[PDB]
């Protein structure tokens, strides 16, 4: 049962290391989020290595998928924590960092934070299950590829198709109507992720001007991803073309 493997390989939740004694400036909050994103990225690698089928993909493709999907996996997991721990009332970044209205404003990402809150509110509406969540998170890892395709495109397509089949088998437990609600939710991630990345690329490019710090893991990923996304080399994969 590959879904039972997914449930068991879910990473431990990470602390932000948020310093509530320091002023709650945009520089301090965003730097904490970036430190958090770096720690989460290590967890994504550990998880992806043991993800059924991932090892079949060549190293270049594994790197491409992780770099293209990092914001998608991260934002989808933030929505899950917000839903599980607060019934989507707040943004649960970490046990030590839960955003209220104050923090949404202070972060200088108010509108993006409300966009994220809208996704977590969809989890409540649909009553998303952990089983559905874990399959969908794998689909997000496989949702953005290069415009000219991957090195082993057929191997990737076989893995993606297999996980789509798993999601269809799973919706029978809570069925065509549910399947399309879940694929609609997955497609909706691309637009929010595009806006999150646009802000991340901005603070990255004007880093010391805005005092926003980035850990080494994020510097490396963004340095590679930013020219590729901006030159139109990233190809978001949609279940239903808008």
């Amino acid at each position: 049962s590959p879904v039972m493997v997914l449930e068991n390989i879910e990473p431990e939740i990470v602390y932000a290391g948020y310093d509530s004694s320091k002023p709650d400036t945009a520089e301090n909050l965003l730097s904490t989020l970036n430190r958090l994103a770096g720690k989460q990225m290590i967890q994504v690698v550990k998880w992806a290595k043991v993800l059924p089928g991932f090892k079949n993909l060549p190293l270049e493709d594994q790197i491409t998928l992780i770099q293209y999907s990092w914001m998608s996996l991260s934002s989808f997991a933030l929505s899950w924590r917000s839903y599980k721990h607060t019934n989507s009332q707040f943004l649960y970044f970490a046990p030590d960092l839960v955003f209220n209205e104050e923090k949404m404003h202070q972060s200088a990402m108010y509108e993006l934070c409300q966009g994220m809150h809208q996704i977590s509110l969809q989890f409540v509406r649909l009553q998303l299950t952990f089983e559905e969540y874990t399959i969908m998170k794998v689909l997000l890892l496989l949702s953005t590829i290069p415009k000219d395709g991957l090195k082993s495109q057929a191997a990737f397509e076989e893995m993606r198709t297999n996980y789509i089949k798993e999601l269809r088998k799973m919706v029978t437990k809570s069925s065509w109507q549910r399947f399309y609600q879940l694929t609609k939710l997955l497609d909706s991630m691309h637009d929010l992720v595009s806006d999150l990345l646009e802000f991340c690329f901005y603070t990255f490019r004007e880093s010391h001007a805005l005092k926003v710090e980035f850990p080494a893991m994020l510097v490396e990923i963004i340095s590679d991803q930013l020219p590729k996304v901006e030159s139109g080399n990233a190809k978001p994969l949609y279940f239903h073309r808008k």
Partner: peptide
């Protein structure tokens, strides 16, 4: 090797 390459190959 990049940090991502290092982590994926270890």
């Amino acid at each position: 090797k990049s940090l991502l390459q290092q982590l994926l190959t270890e």
